[PDB]
Amino acid sequence: SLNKILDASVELIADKGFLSTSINDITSKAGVAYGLFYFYFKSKHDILDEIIRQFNRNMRYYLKTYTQNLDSRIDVEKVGMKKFLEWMNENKKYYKIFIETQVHRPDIYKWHFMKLAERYTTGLSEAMRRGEIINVDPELLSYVLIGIAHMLGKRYVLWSNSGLTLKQQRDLDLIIENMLTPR
Amino acid sequence: ESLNKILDASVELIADKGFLSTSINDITSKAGVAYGLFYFYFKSKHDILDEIIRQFNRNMRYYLKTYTQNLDSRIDVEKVGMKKFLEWMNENKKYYKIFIETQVHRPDIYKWHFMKLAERYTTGLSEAMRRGEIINVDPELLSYVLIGIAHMLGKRYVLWSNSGLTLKQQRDLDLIIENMLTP
Ligand SMILES: CCCCCCCCCCCC(=O)SCCNC(=O)CCNC(=O)[C@H](O)C(C)(C)COP(=O)(O)OP(=O)(O)OC[C@H]1O[C@@H](n2cnc3c(N)ncnc32)[C@H](O)[C@@H]1OP(=O)(O)O
Ligand SMILES: CCCCCCCCCCCC(=O)SCCNC(=O)CCNC(=O)[C@H](O)C(C)(C)COP(=O)(O)OP(=O)(O)OC[C@H]1O[C@@H](n2cnc3c(N)ncnc32)[C@H](O)[C@@H]1OP(=O)(O)O
């Protein structure tokens, strides 16, 4: 019943936004007793916390699937980035949830990026130690790479459904290699 | 001047209480102007978000140009401008809530802000590419990569903490930029 509440919430919030979606809509669409909502969630905004945790987990597994079978950390970045943009395109209906989280639950919005950065920092520190990538604060470098991904996702996937041309995809690979390769 | 009092009052109130809780009565009282005047300048409350975002865009871009006008090397414009952005973002930090709620309440002006910035950015970058200063790639895509970095770094190092970047991190960021952009 918890899971049904969660799945119903995701579809409704993505559709109508947060403020328009009542607990009633959610429990109605989920097909559970209205009372159970309040047991699992003191306030309506507490639902966002578990939603963003699931998205964070799914996005990371998705990307990990494509990055764990790869050689160069520089390949990891190039492929990882490409795959994030594909992922964002598959999940573009849901981006409204993330926008709403930044308004109504800023702590979980921060959590999402900080959790992603924590995972990313480890991987980049290992490549630094091999001499594979530029030796710099690896948290800082994670935010640089995440910031790039987020903004391209907005411009080329959310605000346009063009995606990137082949020429832009080659330019972006060149940007990333040039940034990361020790001179 | 009435218009300027209304705008200043709105900025302060929206930053403090959010957009939904700020009434036109609050705005015009804080402003010290006749209530009905608001409706002469703005059809709706939402229309004053558009004007606020325009003013912040102009003023951010004026501030940065001020530091970057004096530098011939585009590589230096990018290092310095990034630093100056973090300083501006620190100074205007309490206002960032306005931008967050603009994404929900006026998404066309939120997008406009980034598109306008990239428009100005794109011109400066293709100039540098011509002279062989920087890597020859799609200059709008490059804009969005650099804007993306700037935005995520402001979030992590200015809005989510008030620590800022260390001196070492600042040099690391300089290197990241120089590495990305130099063929
Ligand atoms: C609101 C919408 C809009 C949301 C829109 C959000 C906008 C995001 C903007 C930023 C975009 C990016 O930067 S995306 C990054 C693009 N670049 C890259 O991907 C290149 C770098 N890649 C990497 O370093 C890595 O691929 C990662 C770090 C990103 C993720 O690796 P990771 O996090 O270490 O992966 P890992 O722990 O191994 O496993 C991931 C999660 O999967 C689960 N998991 C583990 N095993 C299994 C299993 N058998 N079945 C199911 N699930 C499993 C775990 O519970 C774990 O979460 P848990 O329970 O352990 O916590
Ligand atoms: C909501 C809260 C938070 C909002 C939070 C916002 C989040 C931002 C996240 C990303 C931030 C970034 O990437 S900041 C990017 C950081 N990087 C850099 O700065 C490096 C590269 N820098 C540059 O290339 C340039 O410095 C710029 C592009 C960023 C800006 O140059 P520009 O856009 O050409 O500036 P320019 O048009 O010449 O002047 C800007 C405005 O000044 C006005 N202006 C005013 N007074 C004067 C005057 N006396 N003389 C001339 N012009 C004047 C003009 O009308 C013009 O507006 P008008 O004619 O257009 O009306």
Residue numbers in the entry:
A (entry chain A): 14 to 196
B (entry chain B): 13 to 195
Reproduce the article's own wording on this structure:
FadRSa, of which we show that it displays structural similarities with bacterial TetR-like FadR regulators, is an archaeal member of the widespread prokaryotic TetR family. Each subunit displays two functional domains: an N-terminal helix-turn-helix (HTH) DNA-binding domain (α1–α3) and a C-terminal domain (α4–α9) of which α8 and α9 stabilize dimerization. The finding that FadRSa represses the Saci_1103-Saci_1126 gene cluster and that it is responsive to acyl-CoA molecules acting as inducers in vitro strongly suggests that intracellularly present acyl-CoA molecules cause a derepression and thus higher transcriptional expression of the gene cluster in vivo.
